[PDB]
Amino acid sequence: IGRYPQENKGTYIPVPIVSELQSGKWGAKIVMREDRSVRLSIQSSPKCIVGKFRMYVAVWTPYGVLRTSRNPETDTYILFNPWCEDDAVYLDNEKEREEYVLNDIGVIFYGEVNDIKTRSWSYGQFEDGILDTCLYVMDRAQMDLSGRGNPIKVSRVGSAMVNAKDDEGVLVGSWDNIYAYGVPPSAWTGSVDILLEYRSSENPVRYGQCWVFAGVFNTFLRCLGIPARIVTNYFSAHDNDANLQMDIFLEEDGNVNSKLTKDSVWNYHCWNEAWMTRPDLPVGFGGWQAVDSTPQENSDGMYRCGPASVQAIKHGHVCFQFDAPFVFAEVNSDLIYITAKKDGTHVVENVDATHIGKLIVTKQIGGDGMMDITDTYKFQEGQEEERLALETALMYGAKKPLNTEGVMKSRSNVDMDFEVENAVLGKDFKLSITFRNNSHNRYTITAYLSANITFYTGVPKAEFKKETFDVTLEPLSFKKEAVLIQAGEYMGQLLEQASLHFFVTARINETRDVLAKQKSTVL
Amino acid sequence: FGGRRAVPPNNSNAAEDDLPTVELQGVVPRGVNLQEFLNVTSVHLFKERWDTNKVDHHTDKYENNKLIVRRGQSFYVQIDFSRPYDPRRDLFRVEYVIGRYPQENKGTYIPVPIVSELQSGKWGAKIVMREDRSVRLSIQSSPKCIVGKFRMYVAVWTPYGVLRTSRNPETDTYILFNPWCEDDAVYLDNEKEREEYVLNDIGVIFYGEVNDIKTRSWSYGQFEDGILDTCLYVMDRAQMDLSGRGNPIKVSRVGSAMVNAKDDEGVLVGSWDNIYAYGVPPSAWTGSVDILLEYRSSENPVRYGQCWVFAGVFNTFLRCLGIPARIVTNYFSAHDNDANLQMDIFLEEDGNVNSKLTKDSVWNYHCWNEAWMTRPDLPVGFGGWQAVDSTPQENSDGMYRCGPASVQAIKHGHVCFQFDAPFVFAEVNSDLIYITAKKDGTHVVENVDATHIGKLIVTKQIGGDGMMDITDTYKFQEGQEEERLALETALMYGAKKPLNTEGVMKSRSNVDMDFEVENAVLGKDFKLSITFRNNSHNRYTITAYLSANITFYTGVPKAEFKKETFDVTLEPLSFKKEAVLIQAGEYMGQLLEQASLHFFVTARINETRDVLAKQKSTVLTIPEIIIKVRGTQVVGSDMTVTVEFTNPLKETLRNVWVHLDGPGVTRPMKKMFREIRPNSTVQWEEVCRPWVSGHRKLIASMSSDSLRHVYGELDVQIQRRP
Amino acid sequence: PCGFPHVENGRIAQYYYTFKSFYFPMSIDKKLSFFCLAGYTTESGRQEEQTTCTTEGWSPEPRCFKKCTKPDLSNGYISDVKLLYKIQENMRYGCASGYKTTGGKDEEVVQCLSDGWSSQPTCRKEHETCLAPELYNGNYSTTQKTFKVKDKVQYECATGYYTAGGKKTEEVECLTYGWSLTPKCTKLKCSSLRLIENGYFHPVKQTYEEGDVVQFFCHENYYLSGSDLIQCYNFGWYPESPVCEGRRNRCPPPPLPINSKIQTHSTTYRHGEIVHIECELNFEIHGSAEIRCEDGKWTEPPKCIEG
Amino acid sequence: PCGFPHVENGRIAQYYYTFKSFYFPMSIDKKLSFFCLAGYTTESGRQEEQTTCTTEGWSPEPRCFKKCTKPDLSNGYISDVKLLYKIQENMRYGCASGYKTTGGKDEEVVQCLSDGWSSQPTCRKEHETCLAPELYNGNYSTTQKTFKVKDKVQYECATGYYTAGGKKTEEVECLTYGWSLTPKCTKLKCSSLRLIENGYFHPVKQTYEEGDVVQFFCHENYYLSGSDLIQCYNFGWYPESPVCEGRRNRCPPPPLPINSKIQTHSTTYRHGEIVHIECELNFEIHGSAEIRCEDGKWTEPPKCIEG
């Protein structure tokens, strides 16, 4: 294999003739002889390089070696082997091999966690020229052939090629909603035409976004034979820089400060899981490895994250390579609500640990339904094991810049929540706000609704509706406000994926406490 | 629209924004008497090089007129107002601001509160005095603060919003890493080690081969005019997020990746081609200073570098930002190992070296940096020296730099930790394997040498120019059980041994073999002597071969300049000695740069089939450049420097460049001589006006179309000015 | 010099587990960092801290203390979002309407200590009249069992017994959370345990009563004396009091030959102590009938052989 | 269900130490991967293995044995180049002329057995007239100390000692490499202590000599049912091994009251067991004759006054 093959580098492979094939060794057994002909049972090493090999037959003489000429009809692809107990990618269940390797149609989950949406995606890893294109992606990566036997390194290098910085990558990332001189990321039906367009044009394809990168990378892994799947995380804290805190800023009166609020939580985000053993780590960290081909600032720079062991992430064990603190922070960040006072001080008003990574999903084995996998990424919330994982992550370089140590529950015993009914694009719909007073005190409350049109990354474009309520809660009571949102308010303004985001924030006049809630919805 | 990010990435220190001189709050009335509130008339930073701010921060060495301070430690300023400040009625603060998109929670907008006492580990300002219209502050920076050039503003609060000072470039403040502060991740508890590994600007690089260690000086020059701005420019050209520049791990991880240029990105184009067309030869450079200023002024990769040049430039970058750092040289480095602890030599059946298959090579020496920091990303006890090889190697992420790998992890074989530790461990812990490639195509392991790789590791000693052996900081005493425990721990975590050395054993014959090569000056004949010794009552016949190769210092051969065969009979318990003369005319027409030779001696014992095999290197000695000085050695006085060079060859040298350097004594200078006749000498003279006192060094180098890698230096005491 | 530390719930730097025989025993003034696992913390409330080698071994001592959990609080509330608390930090709790805390207030503060919370978080229902409890080894001053807000009850204990305050006769006040001090009679309360050196104990509290089992331990390079378990009867502590020592040479329980008996099982068998063995019916003794403990070893016992 | 495996000279997957209370005890037929430190191996010669939870506990047990080191032999050579040898791996050594191996050969292959070498590697000298070796706690049947090749000598051990072949009397023959077997007097060794769950014992050996003593320990919130110490004798271990169980389920021994005896003396007592106290002749009881072990407590013992 390659132009400069060497035996000690595994890129020239003489196959010895043997009476029996040993476990874990290259060799060939003469199983039958018939006149001019010999039949060999050949075996390859379970650690073999993956790629397209030239084949020759060589006969020894006292005078030299006699060899077959170049015969392109005998070129042999050698791939990863989920069916072999000695392979680093071995998967111990046949339905899971049949899904995570042999299935060529995926399902991608989008929308928002109260109204989950599905679309199909052609991985097409078997289609004409896709296998050659996966080899071409590693050749354009300039990946050493002796490194292509390793599923960690093939995942680590292959994922870095998916998003193009300058030239030299499969897809140009864009979220500009205009998509001039390219194809909109939301148009693509599958990986097949992206990969063949890249292979034929020899330049980055325009344009991609997280599920497009994940779709292409899932084809790449399944094509070489590494078992792989897409997972969607709802409310993903992307660009976290390993901080476990997303900040929302509030004005003194309790309104949202839109000037300072620049952290944004993605309604959903997609990344790949790849299945392999981890001989670079101590025991207990094999199986699913999270790889995100969407670039963010990590310890190397603006790059893809992982493979991070999902079994390391669940336990907060983020000292292990690669990029695990950044993957942990996407599923485990808090929201912090901060009053930015007129005197220029910042005060933490409220905290919400429940919002980020509320659900993590993937396609089920043998059908199109979702499978909840949240409990594979983190422990049950509000239990001791969530705290043990958080503390383990804080020992190994996850961060909490703001000490919430002084925060306490609202002594008012008031509580607040609101609901948005699901709607069709271009219909009016109702938003209902509820308040409950669990105390013998009377209160008065000023509350604000801010309704925003956003990209699915949570980045806002405009505040399409805003309203204020003054409310009394008489002792141990409850009160409800309702809003009708009309089609003429939002329809002239919607972005792709038709996403809306509502903040409801209120200050209790007597106790000075802040109540804050936020919900997305997708038309 | 732009949906990827709510605000663009704050990743350039050169970039700025215009903060408002007034921010209005509420419905502000017509004609408010704002002159009842404070207005700033002047700000003093006490930034003079003899003053307490630069002296107590150890930043008085930098040739820069702006304020420079180290994070986590306090410094004084004074603010002069329109009227006296009145704590009852006056709220104000200092603001430090960095990049174009500064945000408070990202650490890039920093409001400094006025406080009663400076809290440990917090940004804050204490009023230490008031007199008339002036307030004097002691300001403390956070020990986790971002490193870079901050803008400074003063802002006054009012019932009508904020009044702020206009853009005043006199106030821009560099905040650096702080080795002196116990709370900094880079803290170094020893005074003499901070003096050496941070405040010394002249390095020593060790080269040659382990039996003949050569040395040269290198100007790190981290205090020279415009070098600190160039280190900020390197991080801006990396497009490194400003909020990440508070971390010494990430600054080391990113800054090292900028040194080697792949494409038009990075500081130095690597070359080992011996020709160096359209650029400067890697062996010509006297220091980092002219490389970094050429990069900053051209905005393009400098041509060309090699391992010690990358290490020199990266050492300047680290010491300039204030991360304590040193170069280390490893002798017999197994570079490009791909985490394999085996380097293969191939032999013919008769025991001669098979040059066709022998394509692994062991570098006579190799250079990398160590940076000193704590490692909060790793478990307890992996802080201290971190190895960072800025030279590209095939790696877990393709072809790239290795590290920061903890030296403490490497010694114990804990290569499960980040970054790139298996590849660094293999530089120092690999074995040689000698393999008979039989004519039938089978490979047989004949002999193994675990002792050859990383035979010594060295660095410059603290406060002097001798070598310090640091081999024991990287690996345990050879052949002891703790070396085996480190090896087995590395094999648990992804170090590799491709061939199982189980079918190999002690020699049947009990014959020893060893040989000595005498050191020589370039252009002289010299003796190589081979010995064979019998520890048995048997009689043996041996055929032995000498192969002598000219090689680059990377061990890559160019030509086999001499080949010889010996037949030896050893009587019972006896020994025999073969003397070989190597003549100047066999090698002189053919030498590469650094003038390195490599010898294989191998033999097969006829009665026992055993193979004997050993290999050794020499580097030919080349005479130094002579430097002399005349006139008074006083700061600001004119001093005359003479650089002299005598051609050592029997040929005319052509297009000869001589370079001269010495931080605080002279800027980088160079001189061109069209030709130098065979036995002839040249002189160059300059007038230089030194600007730094105490002990200083002049450094020189020579290069040409044939000879290069030739050096000289002089220690000059410079007296303080009147 | 200092030996390899046994860090329960924690770790030293990971290479010291492999290279033990190279690094230990370790010279004086060497400093060794250690850290606790998640859910645990050092004596100072840190996650990571340094010990130093001394002629007495490691100091400060490498121990990791479990974080105290949020209580499953009956009839009450807490101020905090927190699940786990640092050693010697404190937490505030309070009452539902008509209820009073373990300390009788509307709100109470509790400290996290080595064995758990300084007082158990709980709210009692709040009411008006107190009932006089059952008075084992005493008699009340009156036939009345029910007492109103700020009424008082007086009581007297039996011959040689003492009241809850340690008098022979006592009086206490009814309040809406219960009695100001509870009416009770006992013998003189078990002593406040003598703090040992180079070891420690569980069930740590200021005073003890009949039962109230305590377990003692030594730290590394020391060995306990007395039983690990001790409990007071009403007449006092049994066994008397334990001690720590790094040279303990005490035996296991006495070896018993088949078909044999011994004269009494002691609570201890130190160096120089003796046991006498008697063979059972139809058997005779082979070897010495007496056996001895020396250097923490029993002398190998006799055999019983048929008549 | 199977408790937390105390892996010896090794570890399980390292989150299980933090998340112990979540994962343990494990169900039967669940499997767990464990590994050895460097310098140690599992009994198969692997660095890592799966153990399985069974009705027998963790099987095979998570024990890592130490590698055999290269021997310090003289008058000879070792063919193998390596310093450390895996458990169940084998190694070759050979003699100089005029010397013979420990097995009496020209060359000998030895195996690093389940703990230690199969023979001590050494190249001795042709014994023209063998010399009888030293024989502590035994006697040769003759005053002679030197004997010719194909002469023989017989020896007998002292009371409580056994010959090198496990008899009490034994005979050996002089050969050109030394004796056909080496004379020695020896003692029977107690069987290997298996790894417990939830705790450990500190002095670790493959087998133990008569007069060897072992101390047991538990990790926090688990307690050691049974003895603190156990001793080996030529008849075996005296007590059963103690266990790290939950709660306490064990009481310290009661006093014997003056003028009294008991229905059953014991090494240890457990929850629900009764000690019944009987007064001596011409004495009469007060208090309960029964006392019971309950939550680690006892009820107060009786008194025996003069009749």
DSSP A189-221: -BSHHHHHHHHHH-S-EEEE-HHHHHHHHHHHH
Contact state of D13 with A284 under an 8 Å Cβ cutoff: yes
Contact state of B344 with A396 under an 8 Å Cβ cutoff: no
CB atoms within 10 A of CB B535: 13
**Which residues of chain D neighbour C228 with C-beta distances below 8 Å?**
228, 252
Query: Nearest CB to A457: which of B4, B357, B377?
Result: B4
Query: Nearest CB to A407: which of C38, C78, C81?
Result: C81
Contact state of B440 with A60 under an 8 Å Cβ cutoff: yes
Contact state of A280 with B162 under an 8 Å Cβ cutoff: no
Which chains pack against D, by 3+ Cβ pairs within 8 A? A, B, C
Cis peptide before A490 (omega within 30 of 0): no
**Which residues of chain D neighbour A317 with C-beta distances below 8 Å?**
14-15
CB atoms within 10 A of CB C75: 16
Contact state of D84 with B448 under an 8 Å Cβ cutoff: no
Residue entry with tokens 């792709």: A496
Phi, psi angles (nearest 5°) of residue B34: -55, -25
Chain B nearest-CA residue for A340: B104
Contact state of B488 with D39 under an 8 Å Cβ cutoff: yes
Query: Is B318 strand, coil or helix?
Result: helix
Residue D38 sits at the chain A interface (C-beta within 8 Å) = no
Contact state of B381 with C22 under an 8 Å Cβ cutoff: no
Q: Are C124 and C77 in contact (CB under 8 A)?
A: no
Chain C nearest-CA residue for D210: C300
**Which residues of chain C neighbour B482 with C-beta distances below 8 Å?**
19, 22
**Which residues of chain D neighbour B537 with C-beta distances below 8 Å?**
97
A456 contacts: CB under 8 Å, gap ≥ 6: A110, A266, A267, A268, A496, A497, A499, A522, B3
Query: Nearest CB to B485: which of D38, D79, D80?
Result: D38
CA–CA separation, B206 vs B458, rounded Å? Answer: 7
Contact state of B506 with D84 under an 8 Å Cβ cutoff: no
Instruction: State the Rg of chain C over Cα.
Output: 27
CA–CA separation, A441 vs A423, rounded Å? Answer: 38
CA C145 remoteness from chain centre: 36
**Resolution limit in angstroms?**
3.0
Strands B114-115 and B124-131: parallel
Query: Nearest CB to A297: which of B244, B344, B398?
Result: B244
CA–CA separation, B418 vs A322, rounded Å? Answer: 8
CA–CA separation, B110 vs B148, rounded Å? Answer: 13
3-state secondary structure B22-76: EEECCCCCCCCCHHHCCCEEEEECCCCCCCHHHHHCCCCCCCCCCEEEECCCEEE
Alpha helices in C92-191 (DSSP H): none
Residue A285 sits at the chain D interface (C-beta within 8 Å) = yes
Nearest Cα neighbor of B500 from A502, A25, C198, A113 is A25
Contact state of D297 with C213 under an 8 Å Cβ cutoff: yes
Beta strands in D167-299 (DSSP E): 169-175, 178-179, 185-186, 199-201, 213-218, 223-225, 229-233, 236-237, 243-245, 260-262, 274-279, 283-286, 290-294, 297-298
Residue A284 sits at the chain B interface (C-beta within 8 Å) = no
- What Å distances lie between residue A484 and A374, A429, C68, D90, D207, CA to CA? 34, 6, 49, 84, 83
CA–CA separation, A28 vs C283, rounded Å? Answer: 75
Contact state of D83 with B492 under an 8 Å Cβ cutoff: no
Contact state of C38 with A351 under an 8 Å Cβ cutoff: no
Residue D18 sits at the chain B interface (C-beta within 8 Å) = no
Phi, psi angles (nearest 5°) of residue B551: -135, 155
For C:48-67, CB contacts with B below 8 A are: 48
Residue D83 sits at the chain B interface (C-beta within 8 Å) = yes
Structure tokens at A278: 């981890």
**Which residues of chain B neighbour A146 with C-beta distances below 8 Å?**
338
B264 contacts: CB under 8 Å, gap ≥ 6: B300, B301
Query: Is B642 strand, coil or helix?
Result: strand
Q: Are B528 and B627 in contact (CB under 8 A)?
A: no
Q: DSSP characters for B268-299?
A: EEE--SSS-TTS--GGG--BSHHHHHHHHHH-
- Inter-axis angle of helices B289-298 and B307-321, to 10 degrees? 80
Residue A388 sits at the chain C interface (C-beta within 8 Å) = yes
CA–CA separation, B98 vs B244, rounded Å? Answer: 12
CA–CA separation, B459 vs B75, rounded Å? Answer: 35
Chain D nearest-CA residue for A318: D15
Q: Are B311 and B319 in contact (CB under 8 A)?
A: no
Cis peptide before B557 (omega within 30 of 0): no
Contact state of A283 with D15 under an 8 Å Cβ cutoff: no
* Longest distance between any two alpha carbons in chain B, whole Å: 115
CA–CA separation, B515 vs B616, rounded Å? Answer: 9
One-letter amino acid of C62:
P
* Dihedral, B408, B414, B416, B421 alpha carbons, nearest 10: 50
Instruction: Spell out which chain D residues touch chain C, with contact meaning CB-CB distance below 8 angstroms.
Output: 17-18, 37-39, 160, 210-211, 213, 215, 219-220, 223, 227-231, 233-234, 238-239, 248, 250-256, 265-268, 295-298, 300-301
Q: Are B488 and B341 in contact (CB under 8 A)?
A: no
Phi, psi angles (nearest 5°) of residue B11: -125, 15
CA–CA separation, A480 vs A482, rounded Å? Answer: 7
Which of C297, C299, C305 would you mutate first to test chain D, the one with the most D CBs within 10 A?
C297
Residues of B annotated catalytic, as ranges: 307, 366, 389
CA–CA separation, A209 vs A184, rounded Å? Answer: 9
Q: DSSP characters for B193-217?
A: HHIIIII--EEEEEEEETTEEEEEE
Q: Are A355 and D52 in contact (CB under 8 A)?
A: no
Which of B1, B146, B433 would you mutate first to test chain A, the one with the most A CBs within 10 A?
B1
- What Å distances lie between residue A509 and A254, A294, A472, A515, B411, CA to CA? 11, 44, 10, 11, 63
Binding site, annotated residues of B: 429, 431, 478, 483
Residue D19 sits at the chain A interface (C-beta within 8 Å) = yes
- Inter-axis angle of helices A210-224 and A151-160, to 10 degrees? 150
Which of C12, C19, C36, C47 would you mutate first to test chain B, the one with the most B CBs within 10 A?
C19
Residue C27 sits at the chain B interface (C-beta within 8 Å) = no
Start-to-end CA span in chain A (Å): 53
Structure tokens at D268: 């240890």
Residue entry with tokens 């958080």: A390
Q: Are B620 and B521 in contact (CB under 8 A)?
A: yes
Nearest Cα neighbor of B429 from B487, B497, B367 is B487
Strands D65-66 and D48-54: unpaired
CA–CA separation, A57 vs B126, rounded Å? Answer: 83
Query: Is A254 strand, coil or helix?
Result: coil
Contact state of D160 with C255 under an 8 Å Cβ cutoff: no
Residue entry with tokens 């399980």: D12
Residue B414 sits at the chain C interface (C-beta within 8 Å) = yes
For B:335-374, CB contacts with C below 8 A are: none
Residues of A annotated catalytic, as ranges: 210, 269, 292
Q: Are B431 and B453 in contact (CB under 8 A)?
A: yes
Length of chain B: 722
Binding site, annotated residues of B for Ca(2+): 429, 431, 478, 483
B124: distance to nearest CA of chain A, Å? 13
Q: Are B146 and B103 in contact (CB under 8 A)?
A: no
CB atoms within 10 A of CB B632: 11
Q: Are B666 and B688 in contact (CB under 8 A)?
A: yes
What is the number of CB-based contacts under 8 A between chain B and chain C? 31
Q: Are D230 and D214 in contact (CB under 8 A)?
A: yes
CA A443 remoteness from chain centre: 45
Strands D303-306 and B443-449: unpaired
C80: distance to nearest CA of chain A, Å? 5
CA B214 remoteness from chain centre: 18
D15: distance to nearest CA of chain A, Å? 6
Residue entry with tokens 């080949």: B563
D14: distance to nearest CA of chain C, Å? 11
CA–CA separation, D31 vs A310, rounded Å? Answer: 20
Structure tokens at D253: 């021994």
Query: Nearest CB to B505: which of D38, D80, D83?
Result: D80
Contact state of D295 with C211 under an 8 Å Cβ cutoff: yes
Contact state of B485 with D83 under an 8 Å Cβ cutoff: no
